Amino acid sequence: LCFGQCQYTAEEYQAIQKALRQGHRVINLANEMFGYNGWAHSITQQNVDFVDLNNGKFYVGVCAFVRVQLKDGSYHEDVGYGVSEGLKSKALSLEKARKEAVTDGLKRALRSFGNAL
Amino acid sequence: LCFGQCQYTAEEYQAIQKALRQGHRVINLANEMFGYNGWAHSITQQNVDFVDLNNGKFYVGVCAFVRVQLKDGSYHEDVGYGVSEGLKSKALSLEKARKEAVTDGLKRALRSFGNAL
Amino acid sequence: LCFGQCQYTAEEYQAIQKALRQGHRVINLANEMFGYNGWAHSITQQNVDFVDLNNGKFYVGVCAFVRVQLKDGSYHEDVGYGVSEGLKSKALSLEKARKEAVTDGLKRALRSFGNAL
Amino acid sequence: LCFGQCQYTAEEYQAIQKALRQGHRVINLANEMFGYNGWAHSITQQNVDFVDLNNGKFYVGVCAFVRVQLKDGSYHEDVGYGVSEGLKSKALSLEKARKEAVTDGLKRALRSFGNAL
Amino acid sequence: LCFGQCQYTAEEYQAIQKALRQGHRVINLANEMFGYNGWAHSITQQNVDFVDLNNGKFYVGVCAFVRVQLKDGSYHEDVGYGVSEGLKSKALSLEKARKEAVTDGLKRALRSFGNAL
Amino acid sequence: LCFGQCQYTAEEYQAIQKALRQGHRVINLANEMFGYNGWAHSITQQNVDFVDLNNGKFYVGVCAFVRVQLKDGSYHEDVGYGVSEGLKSKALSLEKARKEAVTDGLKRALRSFGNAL
Amino acid sequence: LCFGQCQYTAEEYQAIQKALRQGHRVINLANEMFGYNGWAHSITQQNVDFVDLNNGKFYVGVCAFVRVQLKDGSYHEDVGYGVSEGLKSKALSLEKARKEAVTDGLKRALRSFGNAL
Amino acid sequence: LCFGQCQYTAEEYQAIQKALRQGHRVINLANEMFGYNGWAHSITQQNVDFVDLNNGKFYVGVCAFVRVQLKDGSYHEDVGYGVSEGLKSKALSLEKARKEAVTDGLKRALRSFGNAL
Amino acid sequence: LCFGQCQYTAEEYQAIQKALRQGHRVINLANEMFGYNGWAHSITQQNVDFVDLNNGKFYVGVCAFVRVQLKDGSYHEDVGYGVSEGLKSKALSLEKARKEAVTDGLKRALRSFGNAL
Amino acid sequence: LCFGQCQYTAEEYQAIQKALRQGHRVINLANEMFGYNGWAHSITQQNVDFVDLNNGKFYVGVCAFVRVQLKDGSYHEDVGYGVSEGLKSKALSLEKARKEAVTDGLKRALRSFGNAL
Amino acid sequence: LCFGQCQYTAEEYQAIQKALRQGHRVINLANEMFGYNGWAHSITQQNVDFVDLNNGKFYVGVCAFVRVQLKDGSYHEDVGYGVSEGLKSKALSLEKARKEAVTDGLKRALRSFGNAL
């Protein structure tokens, strides 16, 4: 059926659970375990907490919520934070903080499914 | 069926209830009890109560609502709070407070299902 | 069927009513009576009434609405209030008040189903 | 069927009407008459009319709308008011007023079904 | 069927119309005529027109819309007004005005169904 | 069927039209013609145009829209206005104006169905 | 069927068209042509353009949109305007303008169906 | 079927197209071509561009969008503009401008169906 | 079927495509190609960019989005702009600009279907 | 079926893919490849970034999002930008910028389907 | 079936996964792997972080969220950032930043499906 409506078989579910019980690495692990079409992730919220200028340096902090969903319908959502310090230009700091926040949120949300992740 | 619409069997329900009657640890317990696809959790609301600057120290407090849902449809929601004191940088304090709030909310919401959690 | 659509049997309903006629304790009682998947609770509204600073002390009051729902569809909603006085730090006072409000609301809403609760 | 969609039988309806023709007490009466799963109640609106400080005393007034619904679908909604005077602390006055308002609204809404209530 | 979808029988409709052709009293009359599950009422809107302080007295006026609905689906809505004068305390005046407004609205809306009401 | 979905019979429609071709009086006429469950009325909008204080007198004007609907689905909506002059107290003037506006709107909307009304 | 879903017969449609090809008068004509349950009208928008005070006289102008709908589903909407000049009191001017606007809108919208109207 | 869902026959469509290929006049033409129940028109938006006072004269301009729809479902929408100059009173200018705008919009939208209109 | 749900036949589609491969003129072409009931157009957005007063002259610019839809469901949307310069009166400039914008948008959107348009 | 719900055949899909693998020109190419009824395009968002006046010259920049959709349901969305410099009049600059933005967005969005575009 | 509802076959899924395990280049790779109708992409959010003027130079930073969806229903969303520095004109900087942000977001979102991308 369509994504979010299919169901696993007994053997497939058992194998997946056994493997589970035991950021490119985590993405590769997820693709190998669930399959390229077996999982999805999205961003539900993001905002900038503060942007401060020190003596020629920028300090930035970003928050982001990441939602991970499976083919069956189960989901997990967690928060991620990104920080950049000691940089000279605003753009690089903001870019790094925003990307790191999303990556950390994805990692934390994907850890909830098992110890392997 | 799809998540949120399936139903347990008599034997499975009895076994789950017997086991129930009796934050990585609680996550592992939940995955072992309900299964990797048997439970879900989400964040419904979050806000910053206050950010104050003392004599070189930051005090922060964060609130968060966490909703836990099962395969059948039952759900439980509870509040969690995170606090950071004595830190030097704003970003670390905010990150720690936000993550701790979500973790505490998840723990409290997952305790409502039984004594084992 | 799915949660919120199932119906009780005559014998089960009679037994539940007889037991009913007669905050970890109330949670345990509810789980024993209705079952781990037989009841649910949620938070519909919450706000801070006031935060005042006395001579080195914080006074806080919080309101919260708690909704309790059963497997059949019946529901009960009630208000709860939490107060903290004599504390030194804002964060602890707020946390205690917020949690106590939710707990009191849950207790009051769960009392409406019978004398046992 | 699900709550809000079932229908009474002729004998059950006749018995209920005969009994009807004739705040823990009213709750017990309702549970005995309709059953623990035969009625529900909720809060639709609530607000604080005024908070005034006299010579060391607090005067408070609260309004609340309470909606009572039955298994069949019939419903009744009424207003309730709570007042607190002569108290010393704001939190206790607010708590008492809010709870009393909800209780009075529930009583008034539950009186509309018959003389027994 | 569910409330708001059932239909009367010819004899029942004829008897009800004959009886109709001819605030606890009106409530009792309605319950006797339509039945405890044969009618419903609700509040759609309410507001405070003005609150004025005279030489130690409070003058208050409240408006309210009341909607009455039957089992078949027919409905009638009317306005009600409540006034309090000569009182000393704000809370009692507001409570009396608000309750009287709802009661008057219910009476006026219930009069539209026939002369008996 | 439910209200707003039923249909008339040929003889009933012919009789109703013949009678039609030819504020308690108009309400009684409508109830006698269409039946206690054959018509409905509601308020869609209402506002206060102005409140002015003359030399000890209040002048008030109110607008209201009234919608009348039948069992089949046909409907008619019209405006009504209420005015009060020469009164001493604000509350009585407002009450009279508001009620008169609704009554006039109902009359005008009910006149559109025929000459008898 | 329900209003807005029925369909005419060939003979009835032909007769209606022949009669069509050829404010109480227009209302009577419409009721005679389409039937008391064959047409409907409503108000979609209304506002006050201006209220000016001359040397003891009030000038008022009101706009209104009127929508006319038939049993089949066809509809026509048109604008109407009402003006009052030379009056002494605000309330009468406003009432007359508002009613005249609705009447003119109804007339203009009902003229679009044929020359007879 | 209901309006907006019926379909033409081959002969009727051919005749209508042949006639088409070739503001009371345009309304009469449309009623003769499509039928009294074969077309509809409505107003989707209207606003006042400007109102300026010259040396004792009013200049007004109004915009309006008119949507024309047929029985099958096809539709056409176009803009219309109305202007009044040299008038003495505001009300007459506004009325004339508003009505002329709607009429012009209807004409322009009805021209899109063919050369005959 | 209803508009927006029908489908072409193979021969009709082939003929239409062959003819396509090759503002009253474009309207006539569209009506001849698709048919009077084979195409539709609408306005989705419109606004005034600026209105400036030079030495006795008005400069105006208007934007408009035009959406063209066919019987099958295919659609095309494009922007149109209208400009008026050297005029003496505001109303004529605005009218001309607004109408020209819609016409240009219609032309551009209708050109996307083929070279013939 | 209706647009956005049909499906290609194996041979047609293979031919289209082979042709794909390899602003009037791109429009002609798209119409020849997918067909006059095989593709659609729309505008989802547009805004003006800035309008600055230099020494007698206007500088303008416009952004636009363009969404391209096919008969099956696949879609692609991309951003386009338009710039005008050295012009004398505001209207021409704005018109050119807005049209160029939409054209560039359409081109970029249509390039994503293959190398031929 | 329609896009977002179809399902892969076992052999096709296996081949796609094997190929996956291993910005025109990435677009070509995606079209070759999934097919011209096998994938889609869209923009969910975009904003300008800051626009600063240095000594004759413009510094710009843009954020964008890109959502990639497949035929089955699986999806992945990621953030992209674009920066422009050292440019002389605002328009070129903004255009380059906005386009680069979307391209980077597309690349990052498309990398999540496998190592080949």
Numbering used by the authors:
A (entry chain G), B (entry chain H), C (entry chain I), D (entry chain J), E (entry chain K), F (entry chain A), ...: 24 to 45, 68 to 162
Article sentences:
Central to these functions, RAD52 promotes the annealing of complementary single-stranded DNA (ssDNA)8,9 and provides an alternative to BRCA2/RAD51-dependent homologous recombination repair. Instead, cryo-electron microscopy and biochemical analyses revealed that ssDNA annealing is driven by RAD52 open rings in association with replication protein-A (RPA). RPA associates with RAD52 at the site of ring opening with critical interactions occurring between the RPA-interacting domain of RAD52 and the winged helix domain of RPA2. Our studies provide structural snapshots throughout the annealing process and define the molecular mechanism of ssDNA annealing by the RAD52–RPA complex.
When visualized using cryo-EM, we found that the two species of full-length RAD52 represent open (RAD52-OR, peak 1) and closed (RAD52-CR, peak 2) ring forms. The 11-subunit closed rings exhibit features similar to the RAD52 NTD, whereas the RAD52 open rings have one or more subunits missing. The structures of RAD52-CR (2.9 Å) and RAD52-OR (3.2 Å) were determined using cryo-EM. The closed ring comprised 11 subunits as observed previously. RAD52 forms undecameric (11-subunit) ring structures, but these rings do not represent the active form of the enzyme. By contrast, the RAD52 closed rings bound to ssDNA with reduced affinity (3.3 ± 0.5 nM) comparable to that of the RAD52 NTD (3.2 ± 0.6 nM). The RAD52-ORs annealed ssDNA in reactions stimulated by RPA, whereas the RAD52-CRs exhibited a reduced ability to promote annealing that was unaffected by the presence or absence of RPA. RAD52 open rings form more stable complexes with ssDNA (40 nucleotides) and RPA compared with RAD52 closed rings, as measured in pull-down experiments, which may explain why the RAD52-CRs do not cooperate with RPA in SSA. The closed rings may be an artifact of protein overexpression.
